[PDB]
């Protein structure tokens, strides 16, 4: 049962349980984890190579895709398993088969809960630095029984 | 200024700032960080090699020192810069010149605040799993301008 980055996932699991206990609904929990991601995305953008490797003018869905690839290589030393520009019209969908956030997590009866919504917030924060108004949510999470984690980035 | 594990560092930084805003004294903030550490410590003991690589019967000061070395190897893939059972008789002092928690943090003021007290709690929790009663506190932190981070493990 090998775990990568045990400190990070233990701290995140703590935040997830705290969030679930301090909110009234699954949707409120999703939004609170997104807010957490937006708050830590500020430091993650400025304190890492992301602010140096990304360009100032992010205009198109293809530019957003490139920006996502830069985030992934800087934070996780890999590419996303898929970036899908066509299935959700007006969106960019990102797939990760080995998400760091939910390793070995198994929640039942919580299919509406985006366990890894912190990453939705981190992407919204980075796009906001580029003055790209975006809405990001998690479509699927291995934590709730899916085969991969998938986030949906809508430029809106 | 390159940072190791930027997601962990930023998430922890969020926790510290929220803790400082919610507590009524620096020592209360210190205690909240140690309590977070104890919770993290439970997860890192159950979900890493620490439990499989450490002795079951920890009886001497020398045994506690070797346990600390194993924690450091598993969590950080390094040894502490110093483990001191000399300067503080009855306690064990751990020195880390490149602490993960406070990379690039430079607080102003905050005398008495241990930015990295989360690791005091992790240590206290692991020792507790080994039936070793300890109180752990941070002597100094690079976040408040020291050149090193030092934690003091007091036995009994
Ligand atoms: Zn995930
Ligand atoms: Zn430190």
Residue numbers in the entry:
A (entry chain A), B (entry chain B): 2 to 157
Give verbatim excerpts from the published study on this entry.
Here, we take a structural approach to assess the relatedness of these eukaryotic-like proteins in Asgard archaea, the closest known prokaryotic relatives to eukaryotes. Asgard archaea roadblock, longin and TRAPPC3 domain-containing proteins form dimers similar to those found in the eukaryotic TRAPP and Ragulator complexes. Here, we adopted an X-ray crystallography approach to compare the structures of a potential Asgard Rab small GTPase, several RBs and two TRAPPC3 proteins to their eukaryotic counterparts, with a focus on Thor and MKD1. We conclude that the emergence of these protein architectures predated eukaryogenesis, however further adaptations occurred in proto-eukaryotes to allow these proteins to regulate distinct internal membranes.
Finally, we investigated the TRAPPC3-like proteins from Thor. The crystals were pink in color indicating potential Zn2+ binding. We scanned Zn2+ fluorescence for AB25 Thor-TRAPPC3 using X-rays to confirm the identity of the cation and collected multiple anomalous dispersion (MAD) diffraction data around the Zn2+ edge to solve the structure at 1.91 Å. We further analyzed the homology around the Thor-TRAPPC3 Zn2+-binding site. We found that the predicted Zn2+-binding sites and the experimentally determined sites are not completely conserved in positions of the coordinating residues, rather they appear in similar regions and appear to serve the same function in tethering the β-sheet to the D α-helix to create cavities. Interestingly, mouse TRAPPC3 has evolved to replace the Zn2+-binding site by a hydrogen bond. We speculate that Thor-TRAPPC3 may also bind small molecules, potentially being involved in ligand transport. The cavities appear to be accessible from the exterior close to the dimerization interfaces. Furthermore, we uncover structural evidence that TRAPPC3-like proteins exist in several branches of Asgard archaea and are likely to share a common ancestor gene with the V4R-like domain.
